[PDB]
Design a binder for this molecule. Sequence first.
Ligand SMILES: C[C@H]1O[C@H](O[C@H]2[C@H](O)[C@@H](O)[C@@H](O[C@H]3[C@H](O)[C@@H](O)[C@@H](O[C@H]4[C@H](O)[C@@H](O)[C@@H](O[C@H]5[C@H](O)[C@@H](O)[C@@H](O[C@H]6[C@H](O)[C@@H](O)[C@@H](O)O[C@@H]6CO)O[C@@H]5CO)O[C@@H]4CO)O[C@@H]3CO)O[C@@H]2CO)[C@H](O)[C@@H](O)[C@@H]1N[C@H]1C=C(CO)[C@@H](O)[C@H](O)[C@H]1O
Ligand SMILES: *[C@@H]1O[C@H](CO)[C@@H](O[C@@H]2O[C@H](CO)[C@@H](O)[C@H](O)[C@H]2NC(C)=O)[C@H](O[C@@H]2O[C@@H](C)[C@@H](O)[C@@H](O)[C@@H]2O)[C@H]1NC(C)=O
Ligand SMILES: *[C@@H]1O[C@H](CO)[C@@H](O)[C@H](O)[C@H]1NC(C)=O
Ligand SMILES: *[C@@H]1O[C@H](CO)[C@@H](O)[C@H](O)[C@H]1NC(C)=O
Length: 830
Amino acid sequence: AIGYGYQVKNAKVDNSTGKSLTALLQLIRNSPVYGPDIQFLSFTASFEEDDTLRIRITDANNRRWEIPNEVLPRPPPPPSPPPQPTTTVLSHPHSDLVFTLFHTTPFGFTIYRKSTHDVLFDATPIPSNPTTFLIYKDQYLQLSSSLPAQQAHLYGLGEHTKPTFQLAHNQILTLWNADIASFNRDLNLYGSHPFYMDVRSSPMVGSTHGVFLLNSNGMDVEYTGDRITYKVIGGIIDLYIFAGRTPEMVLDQYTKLIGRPAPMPYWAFGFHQCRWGYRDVNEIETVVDKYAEARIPLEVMWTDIDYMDAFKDFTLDPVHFPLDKMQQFVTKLHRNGQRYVPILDPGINTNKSYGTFIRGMQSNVFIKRDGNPYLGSVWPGPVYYPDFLDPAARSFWVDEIKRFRDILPIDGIWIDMNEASNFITSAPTPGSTLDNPPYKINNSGGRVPINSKTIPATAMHYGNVTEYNAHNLYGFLESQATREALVRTSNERPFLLSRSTFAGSGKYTAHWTGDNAARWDDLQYSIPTMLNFGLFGMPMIGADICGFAESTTEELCRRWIQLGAFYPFSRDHSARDTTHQELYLWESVAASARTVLGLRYQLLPYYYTLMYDANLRGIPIARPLFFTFPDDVATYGISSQFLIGRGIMVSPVLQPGAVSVNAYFPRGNWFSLFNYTSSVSVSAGTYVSLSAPPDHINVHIHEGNIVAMQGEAMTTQAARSTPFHLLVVMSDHVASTGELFLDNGIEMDIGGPGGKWTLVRFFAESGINNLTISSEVVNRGYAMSQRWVMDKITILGLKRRVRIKGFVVSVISDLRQLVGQAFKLELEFE
Ligand SMILES: C[C@H]1O[C@H](O[C@H]2[C@H](O)[C@@H](O)[C@@H](O[C@H]3[C@H](O)[C@@H](O)[C@@H](O[C@H]4[C@H](O)[C@@H](O)[C@@H](O[C@H]5[C@H](O)[C@@H](O)[C@@H](O[C@H]6[C@H](O)[C@@H](O)[C@@H](O)O[C@@H]6CO)O[C@@H]5CO)O[C@@H]4CO)O[C@@H]3CO)O[C@@H]2CO)[C@H](O)[C@@H](O)[C@@H]1N[C@H]1C=C(CO)[C@@H](O)[C@H](O)[C@H]1O
Ligand SMILES: *[C@@H]1O[C@H](CO)[C@@H](O[C@@H]2O[C@H](CO)[C@@H](O)[C@H](O)[C@H]2NC(C)=O)[C@H](O[C@@H]2O[C@@H](C)[C@@H](O)[C@@H](O)[C@@H]2O)[C@H]1NC(C)=O
Ligand SMILES: *[C@@H]1O[C@H](CO)[C@@H](O)[C@H](O)[C@H]1NC(C)=O
Ligand SMILES: *[C@@H]1O[C@H](CO)[C@@H](O)[C@H](O)[C@H]1NC(C)=O
C-alpha cells in the first residue's frame, strides 16, 4: 500500500537534566508510492514550557527544510537520539500534559491530559489501515490522529471561506497561498495557518487545547470527525501542543511561540474608505468632502493601483495623480486629523527607465529560475519578484520605501498580490518532481498544479531555498520588510495591511478577507473568517464592507455597515467594474452609518484596550462566544454572532427583507448599547427573537462588565478630546470589572518601559445598602498630562436606583473626576 510505517529502534528520556525524549525510528518496509521512504527518523518530544509540548520528527540522516529561525525565532530542538507492548513516557510535575511513545508495529504516540485523564492527540495506528500510519517520504508526510467525533469541536486551519466557524466533518482543507477570491467557499485562499483549536464538550466541558504544525509546505488536511490527518508535501514534522486549559490560555501559549500581535495605532480603528478605480486626485478629494457633508466619520483615505504611473510601485501618475496635488491632498488630510494609505505590489516592472527596476537589478534582489530572474506577470506588465529572503532585497525594499516617503507623506502601507500572484503560469521544468509533485494537494479544489498563477516551485531564493518550500512564507516575509521599512522611516507606530499571510504574520501586519462579494452569503462569511484570524494571532481583521466584487444593493450595504462598524478593521472597498458604494450615496445607509459608527467611536478606548490585551496575551478583539462562556456547549456552533472583548455581543441581520433576528443569549442579563432600557434576561442559555429595524442592529452588553467610553466625533483625534463616560453593568453574582489602556496612540513599543502610557482598572460591587465604584492607576503620568476627565457614570443591571451620599437605570452627573487619578466612589440605594 501507501506506506508500512516505522518501528521504535531506541528510545530514552534524558535523566536528571531537563526532561525530554529522544528516539530513533526505522522504516518497517519500503514502498514505491509517492516517492522513496526516509529510512531513519529522529523523533523527539520536549516541553518548551509547562503548557507546551513539542514533537519534532526529522530525517536522522539529512537536514530537511525547516522554517528559518530568522523568520520565526523559537527555542532550538533538544538533542537527537544515539545510533502488552513497550512504552516510553515523558512527563513534567508542573505540566498537565503527558507524552507516551508506544513501541508497537507500526509505532504510535499519544498526548493525554492529567487534569481529565483524557486523550488530546492520539497517533496510535490501526495496524490494518495505512491511512492512520505515520508516513515520511521526501514529498509526502502523513500524520494522523483520532478524535472523539462528538466531543471534539475544531476551529482554524485557514485560510478558508466557510459558512460555519466550527469545522464541518468530512472535508479536505488545503493550505497553499493562492490568489483565489474569498467569495469562493472551501478553496485555499491567500494565507496558510496550520493551527487548530480543539474545544472538548466532554468529559470536562470547555476544556481546550491547541495543535500547531510548524511547516510552510503545501498540505491537505483531512477532517472526518473521528480523525484528522495531515498530508504534507515537504519539510518536517514540527508539532506543538498547547495545554490550555481555557480557550484564552491556548492563544496565549500559541502567540507566545509565533509572536505577539503587533500593536495598531489609534487612528487605525477609525473608518476607512477605498476603491479600485478612483480616477484622479479630484475624485478622492470629493469623496472625503462628501463624507464630511454626510457627517459620517472618515478616518483614512486609501488609494489603489490607480495612483501609480501605469501600475508601477513608488511612482505617481503625472496626469491623474500629480505629485504636487497629492502633497496638497495629504497635507489637508493631516490638517483635519485624517490619514492616507497607498497600495503596493511585490512585482517590479521590467522598465529600463524605471528607477526601482534599475536599482533592484544592481543589488541582485530578484527571485531566480534556471539562473535568471523569473519573469512574472501582474498589473504593470512583465515583472521581477523581490526575494524577501535575501537581506539585500530587504534593504532595497526599505530604500525604495524611504525614497517614496520623502516625496510623499504616507501614514501606512497596503501590501497586495503577495502570494505571489502571477497572471501567466510557467511551464514545468522537465524531470522535476518539484514542479510535478508525486502527491497533488487539492489546490483550487481540483488538484490544480501548485505552480498555477504563481512563481514556479523550481525558482530559487537566497541560501539556495526553493520556492517549493518557501512559498507560503512570501507574504509573511514582505510584511517583515515593509514593517522594517516603515519603522526606519518614521518614529510612529506603523500600520500595514497584507493579503497573503502565514502563521506569525499578525506580529507584523493587519489582514482583510480579500476579494469577497456583494452577496448575503459573504456578509455572514465575514464572521467565521474574522474569528479564525483571531485564533491565528491576527486580531486586526475585517472584510470589505458592502462587498468588493459585484454591485451591491441598498439593503445589503445597510446591513453590512451595521455589522462592519464593529470589525476590528473597518473599511469600505470595491472593484471598479461595480457601482460605487460610499456610505453617503443612500440616506437609509448613511443614517445607519452615523448610528453604528457613532457607537464604534464611543467604543474607541475599549477597542484600543482590547488591542493592548491582544499584544499582551494574544487574546483576540473580536472573539467567539465560547471564549467568555466555555461551559455553554450551545455557543460552540454559533457562526452568526460574536463578541467584542469579554462582555459585548453583536447580533446582526444576515438575510434580506427581515426585521428580526433569532440570536442566542448565554445565561445572564444583557443590555442594549443603543437603549439601556432594552434588556434581555435568561436563567439559562436560549435563542431570543429581537426586533431588528432596517436601521437597527442588536448590540448588547453582559452583566459584570465595566466599559470606559468617550464621545462621538468625526475623527479619532477629536474623539480623544471628549469626556469619558463610564458604563457600569452590575451583577448579583460577581463584582463588575473593567480595564482601560491609555497611550499617545502612536508609541512604537506599546506599554513598554518608561511612562508614555497609563493603565486603569475599574471595579464595582453592590452591598445591601451601599454600592462602591473604584479605580486603580498604574503609571498615572501620561493620562494626567492628557486632561482626560470622567463626567458621567451610568449604572445598569440593578433593580434599585442609586445616588451619591425589572431593572432600573442610574446616572451620576457632574463628576469632573480625573481619569488618571485613582478614586473610590460611594453610592446609596433608594
Ligand atoms: C480584482 C481581482 O482580480 C483578479 O481576480 C479575479 C479573477 O481574475 C477573475 O477571473 C475572477 O475569478 C473568479 C472566477 O470568476 C470564479 O468562477 C472562481 O473561480 C473558481 C471556479 O469557480 C472553480 O470551479 C475552481 O475552478 C477549478 C475547478 O474546480 C477544477 O475542476 C479545474 O477545472 C478544470 C481545469 O481548469 C482544467 O485545466 C481541467 O483540468 O479540467 C478541470 C475540470 O475537469 O480547475 C479550475 C481552476 O483552474 O476554482 C476557481 C478559482 O481558481 O473564483 C475566481 C477567483 O479565484 O474573479 C477574481 C476576483 O476578482 C485578481 O486575481 C485579484 O488579485 C484581484 N484583486 C486584488 C486587486 C486589487 C486592485 O489592485 C485590489 O483592489 C483587491 O483588493 C485585490 O484583492
Ligand atoms: C516605462 O515607463 C514609462 C513611464 O511610465 C512608460 O511611458 C509612459 O507610458 C504611459 C502609458 O503606459 C503614457 O501615458 C506616458 O505618456 C508614457 N511616458 C513617457 C515618458 O513615455 C513606458 O511606456 C512605454 O512607452 C509608451 C510610449 C507606450 O508605448 C507603452 O506601451 C510602453 O510600454 C514604459 N515602458 C515599458 C517598456 O514598460
Ligand atoms: C428603549 O427601549 C425600550 C424597551 O424596548 C422602549 O420601550 C423605548 O421606547 C426605547 N426608547 C427609544 C427612544 O427607542
Ligand atoms: C453605607 O456604608 C458606609 C460604609 O460602610 C456607611 O458609613 C454608611 O452609613 C452606609 N450608608 C447607608 C445608607 O446605610
